[model samples]
Target: ATAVVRCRTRLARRVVAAVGPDGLLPAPCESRVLESALALALLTEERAEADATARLTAYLRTTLRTAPPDPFQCAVARAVLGRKRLMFRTVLAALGATGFPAVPWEAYDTRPQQSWLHMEMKALKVLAAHGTGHPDVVRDEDWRALLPALEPGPAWECNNLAQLLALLALRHSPRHRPALGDVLKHVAGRLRPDGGMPYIDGMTVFTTAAAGLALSLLPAPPACVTPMADALALRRNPDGGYGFHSGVAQSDVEDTCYVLEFLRRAAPDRHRTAVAEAEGYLLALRNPDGGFPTFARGTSSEIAMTAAAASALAHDPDRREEVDEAVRYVVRHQRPDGTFERSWSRNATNAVFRAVLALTGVAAHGEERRSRARAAERALAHLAATQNGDGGWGHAEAEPSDPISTAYAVIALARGPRARPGGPLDRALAYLVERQHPDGGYRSRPDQAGPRPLLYDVPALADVFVLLALAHAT
Candidate 1:
């Protein structure tokens, strides 16, 4: 009853209170939370073995040690082993500890930067104190790049966790010590009323555009849509793309395409100029490999980003070349098993759904149509073959079904030639319909990974995607 919910969206705030123990939102990621918790444990390591510290120690040994050795996981394992005075080799094979020792300077300087670098830098600080890492790489140039990232300005991709890691990295540097208070203040802004820190600042632009598309499928669109679409249109960056949220300088293919799609569907004539500029931005993101990247033009292309870009640019006569190339790029990535390479989302259905939709959108007259149709059919078969016994899909084949991935599979299958009432499409829809709350919302684990490997939840997306799946089925 005393729960205080603080979030950017009205829906998010309600989610905070509803999905609660009455004092916390379920932004579950053991990695970010434990990373900071470990820091606190270490600070008091010399004093005593308190309950929290002992529990943390047990968790690190039994839990985190067995985690798949992604970069962040390995970094944590390295620190854990380092602290215990265990020979690095004792845990090396288990963690697949490789390619993590050296610190690259570009992690701090590059424009198309990896967000994990901040955490790596902070992890280095922890290990160095424990006598296991390079201490010299946190140089003046690194500080220069990192300090600005703490502020709420353009090029700010560093989220609440990144900001916290930056603080941990610079906590001891004498030159930067004076600015620590101000930096801490900015980081604290992310603190939820119930004392949780979200992974990113917010997903207003993304959630709003997605929700608009979902709501627009109603027989009569809601009144909030016109102004919502107009507001999103106006928020476009000078570079002609929309960021994940307001005030973020960089633009990615996914958000830009989502907004472009919503505008095109809502009022193509009135927002024609905005649409054109956003399309230009998407076109510019095309890599030489015929695929589209998430952010900068030079960055590596991803399967889902390419799919989203191709889907948005499809059906336009002027965008045939870009669309064709993207279609080719997407078709080329399909594995023999029919799943595409993993994208930002861990859910197996996410990339396949978007890819099938993009391929189906080709609208070509010759071999392209046949080729795209063939690929989409294989993908759909994969989805149908993978559906759980309970009539839903999951993150990967044979995994337990989740509402989000199930909805994605349903939308793709529903839009395909195979959709029939009382079939798998209807069964999946039935699964979702049964789960809807009396308050008219659905709940599921978040599958979208930001910065490529960190799962972040946006509660509203569950409702939006479910709505889209239902609309498409109809």
Candidate 2:
């Protein structure tokens, strides 16, 4: 029990707390190998009992599905066995620790060229490698490689795990020990009440946008709506877009769309400038094929992002050309079986919902309108056909149903052209209603993905989307 409690104070606590009693985190992607391995190392360092250490080590082996070989596992294994592994320089290189003429570790985007494991492996390398060496044996090159990752400003702060690793690294240096308080202060700020931590601190902008949008439709909307709208207007970046978090400098297309959708519904008159700037940010991100990419222009367009871009831009009459082009891009990508390629989720219906909604909302003349209708028709049919035995939808065809996918399907069906709320829609609503708690919240697995296909949980999203679905159904 002390192992669980003490682990909460240090680097490994979130892994222990975030994982529920069932050895899961309410996410479909349940392989917690990287998290488990790090927690195991921390336990061993604390001189935990052999049984306690072994239990965590054992936990790493039981995953819902087979995960591919991870190179960072070698470093953690060595740390547990008391052996030296990657040199500090190698760790820095992998971390893309230096800027300018040097490519620091590239964060994950939807592009195929990026590796999802690179950032986590680099952070783990720092933590594990630092453990195997003498704290006093450090070199100038090592400090130079490491200090940039721990620089003084918010822009200098790395992702959640990397920030924690940097704090651990700083703790071992006598000269750098003074900075430890500051680093720990930032790390401590992100801790959750459940003793868990988020993958990127919290998604302040995304959560505010989503929660605000969900509650906006209620008959007696919460009193927080005006404040949420005010808060979102101030979160806009210098480039006229919104990042997932407030302190982060770079912004992405998806977060921008989420903000626009919420603000347009809740306070269009009050937030017209914010809405316009965001629309321009999104418009400038389009590719030649009339599709949108996640991060930058000229990058390969993503199907889900294009769908969201179109849907968000649908209400602006001046952006008709871009919106129509965006709708066309979605139709072109629809598969023969009526599914779209899953970009940000493991669940097929997430992307399908966005695609169906986009095609359903936009008006296009001639072949564009006809093709859009046919594509939506085919996608909706596929969703109806794939309903599970329990009457809910799942991540993919023929799998056990979950609330996230089911709500997504419900929202799409309830709002789309052919929506007459009986039959499949009725059964899906029944599934969701049965799963709801007495407290008026839903418990569901996460279908959303980040940094591409790696699944992480944002606990409140289940309730938010469920409420949104119920609103559409009513």
Candidate 3:
């Protein structure tokens, strides 16, 4: 993902994780592939592994029904359960294929236009050609063509959707290619430690920085923050923004904003020049209209990225003019209905919180003051009105309350001008306290699950945000 969002859940018993009758997992988009790997193993070793195999197929079917029906999961299910229970047929039913997107995904992923077009064409080619047609996901056989994941390390950093695409293609290919076994073996080689195949290998750079920033507040160890800050300093992509890790993807505004905040707390001196260089990179990301885009140098400016750019600039006097422009850009992006638009997250609270935080850094001048304050107050009220009865926020404005969002609401509100209020802030504090895990970390729901479930960001990111929110409150 160009930018990402995350959580603290498991509070008040907010989750419903379960194991199947035989102590196996049921099929769900997040876990089906994870469990399928184990099921595939059990099939050969145990003579009576039929139940597990049956469960795997059932899981494939179960996951395909996911609210909007995850296309990648449907592809995997069809690859394995081919024609069984008419998997593809059902998937198409849910896809609502009768219509096409009114707004085409032309600007998808911000890759160089040539590169983006190739990835899109390859997928379509693969579909039309069916199994006989396997298009190269990688360009020119360059494994490192995709940064961060060109080579494998102790584990993959972000392999979700890309990996699934590979798995589906290889699985459906003709059996005569006995060498396919090698391809299949490598696919399961990258399970996340949590037992699922996450959308990303893990946003190690982003996650580490975020964790260290919050941990610094707990007064644990000066050493804790040092390593993370150092790594971020070392990992700057040539373009000047942090790219998940060395060469994962192009630098985006969110990752840059996150690192800037991390450095302020983790390594003050070291981050100075680094921040300056990154600042140049971020400024280059600005669209003609005065807002920032996720992928470097995009045409449209998004709210979350714009918000981050504004916040990142607000602290530096040299960039005061840009900050004002960014705040104005932010004000223009807010929806009249008291909300903001963000592609990275479907949740309105996430966008609102981001806008609120970014605007806080601005020292608005004259008429701009009216717009900034007006935008922020509406966001705050939107947040307050949307607060769940459980004292938490959810995936979207009317969505179920979850931990990460709860923390988001808490942090945004607590840091706002109206922090003295006891209603929303107080209840949110109670919710977080109730949800704190024994391990001192929190879990996030899939929220919106593709590049996300597979290649978006990382996990511990939830704990970092929750901890930061709590830290800010203190």
Candidate 4:
């Protein structure tokens, strides 16, 4: 009984420290990491801080007003300890002895769409190899596969999840030294002046691009774009496309498109070759089917990645024919009910935005241009038909309206004639205005790759999305 207390306290200490001291807990849905930590603290009150104890108890009482269902197994305990508790149970399994199984440390895996790259499975491969060094999963090739992700800031969410795997894999075979020293040093580099790993490594290239572009929509494209233009141009790969951060990974089409969408306007003349590099990377990514994949060149294609690539490349005159094919590829893939599927986002708005952005390319499709225009209209109709009665859209079509999904849909709708003066756009705008909190910010469903306890929040990423839509209307 008391031993379980130790595990519980371990979780509370790190988690509360992560959130810092707060009398008020965040929403249970939004920050279950904190809720779990608060629950964990009460479980080990003997070791808890005296001052925060009352706040913890209040949080517990307020959220636990009614009786709750129990777990067959200790999900709470497992969530708390994670793989660190592996040794005890793993001893039996490794000894050919009898006991419980270790909690799989990394996220099990992502959907086929995300199969391009994720560090969790790779990290687990290292642990398995160390426990039993035969499979050789963490090979030189595995390192190559991981290189693409190192820079795109989202790829390093777990504090360089891939690098930790390489370190462990090297431990399994001492001569197998990777650039482990450099990676570990960089992990140290991300530490804050306050000294803690951030939930994300960096996504500022995205911040300036998104807000800068949205800010452009408001005073109707003024001079605020110049400074960030030079800022983004500097972060871009000399070979083209930006890593999630400066000098992180080489390139991935998702973020490549994000930065390109901004850079094309912000610093077009200054970065001609950078634009050319993104073009070549995307061209090779289109499959026989004309869709694009992430993490590799045409290895596996997803609808969103395809749409994103086309949108990014569509703006280029030299790439117009290439963009047209992708536009046709997505239109052919659309369901009769007017929906497109993406693994990461359940909402249809994401699909609509990417599709329309690509479809609305420069009038260079020739014969294909008319079809591209029609596809955008159909996609817009799909968006209108599926919008919720509340004037917001859900993370999925017909799902409960949420801020991220609703905001994205609003931006998508506004891009078309639907956004002109009133009607559905007005209703959607009203919904967004109503949701703004006193602090002038909003939180929505997080953009997560899997169901896990690993910390992830875009630090008001959705806040940026909302600001874009609101800024456009203003």
- Candidate 1 per-residue lDDT over residues 1-474, each given as its tens digit: 101111112233233333222221223222343343333333233233344344444545554445433455446544544511221221232233533333333432344244444443533443343234445645555656457544643225535544544555565566766765554434434434333344665677787777667556655555566666787888888989987777666677888988888888886888999889998998877899989888777878988898899888884788888888888998898999988977778888888889988988767778888988899999998988888888899888868888899988977897676546667776786777666665657788878875456566677678677766765665
- How much does each candidate deviate from the true structure in C-alpha RMSD? 7.7, 10.5, 9.0, 12.1
Which segments of model 2 are wrong by more than 4 Å?
1-148, 151-158, 164-197, 218-223, 417-422
TM-score of each: 0.78, 0.71, 0.72, 0.66
Cα displacement (Å) at residue 369, model 4: 5.5
Q: How do the residues 377-415 of candidate 4 rate in per-residue lDDT, one tens digit apiece?
A: 788788788878888888666588877787777766766
Candidate 4 TM-score, true structure as reference: 0.66
Residues 416-462, candidate 2: write the lDDT tens digits: 54434467777777787677665555677777665345466666567
Q: By lDDT, is 2 or 3 better?
A: 2
lDDT of 2 at 220: 51
Question: In candidate 2, how many Å is residue 333 off?
Answer: 1.1
Which predicted model would earn the best TM-score?
A: 1
lDDT, residue 285, model 4: 63
Q: What does the lDDT read for residue 268 in candidate 4?
A: 74
Worst 10 residues of 2 by lDDT: 4-13
Q: After superposition, how far is residue 307 of candidate 4 from its true place, in Å?
A: 2.6
Which stretch of 10 consecutive residues in model 4 shows the poorest summed lDDT?
20-29
Weakest lDDT window of 10 consecutive positions for candidate 1? 1-10
